[PDB]
RNA sequence: GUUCGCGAAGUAACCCUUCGUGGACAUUUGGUCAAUUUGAAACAAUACAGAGAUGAUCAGCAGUUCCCCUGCAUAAGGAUGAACCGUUUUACAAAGAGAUUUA
């Protein structure tokens, strides 16, 4: 085990020596997360992405990924509460809107997107919203 | 222990000693801390490594870090003080073509 174990040991180490210079690169925030998510280990990968979103909180390939990162695993209320931060955070971001629609879609649980749109056309977003509806 | 009053004793022109009593006066220090190995100075020596850029040799000054030492110091030095010069795949589709395939 301690093959891999000072391999976990080393591995934080070269990664978060890297970000405590840089705190911006989103890109490197993501793959140091993705390395502890193919640890099996979501404590310290959730860790990360709260750490990430306070750098920047408006990169929402940031928040994809970090919802992504929680429907991969399947777990599904981390991903239903995150999103009364999300969408409360940026409200005028088109994609954070469609994309936790569509997941309420495969979920099949139409009466949850009966509230949404209605939060949603009452916010006034504009054409290809409005559509959608 | 002092002093004021009281009650006696002995000496006694009520004075000096001594014993027994009431009140007064004076009133809460210090520790965050126990006296060698097991609750934490450092250096020197030895061993290894070697002090930027570049074809090569050199003056340097900065910035960044959950880095310091010397100095009164917001000065100036400390290898241009040190550590950083590694790794990098999705807000993702539009158009078409073939093939597979089903009411
Ligand atoms: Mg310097
Ligand atoms: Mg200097």
Same mark, same amino acid.
């Given at each position: 085990?301690?093959?891999?174990?000072?391999?976990?040991r080393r591995?934080?180490?070269?990664?978060?020596?890297?970000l405590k210079?840089?705190?911006?690169?989103?890109?490197? $925030? %993501? &793959? #140091?997360?993705?390395?502890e998510?193919?640890?099996?280990?979501?404590?310290? /990968? =959730?860790?990360?992405?709260? *750490? !990430?979103?306070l750098?920047?909180s408006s990169?929402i390939?940031? $928040? %994809? &990924? #970090?919802?992504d990162?929680?429907?991969?695993v399947?777990?599904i209320?981390? /991903? =239903?509460?995150?999103?009364? *931060? !999300?969408?409360?955070t940026?409200?005028?971001?088109?994609?954070? $809107?469609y994309? #936790?629609?569509?997941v309420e879609?495969?979920?099949?649980?139409?009466?949850?997107? =009966?509230?949404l749109?209605?939060?949603?056309?009452?916010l006034?977003?504009?054409?290809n919203?409005?559509?959608?509806?």
């Amino acid at each position: 085990l301690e093959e891999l174990r000072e391999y976990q040991r080393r591995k934080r180490t070269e990664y978060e020596g890297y970000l405590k210079r840089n705190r911006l690169d989103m890109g490197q $925030w %993501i &793959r #140091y997360a993705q390395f502890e998510i193919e640890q099996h280990d979501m404590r310290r /990968a =959730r860790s990360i992405f709260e *750490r !990430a979103l306070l750098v920047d909180s408006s990169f929402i390939p940031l $928040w %994809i &990924r #970090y919802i992504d990162a929680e429907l991969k695993v399947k777990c599904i209320n981390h /991903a =239903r509460n995150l999103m009364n *931060r !999300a969408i409360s955070t940026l409200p005028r971001v088109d994609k954070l $809107w469609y994309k #936790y629609l569509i997941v309420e879609e495969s979920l099949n649980n139409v009466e949850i997107v =009966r509230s949404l749109y209605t939060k949603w056309c009452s916010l006034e977003p504009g054409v290809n919203a409005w559509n959608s509806f």
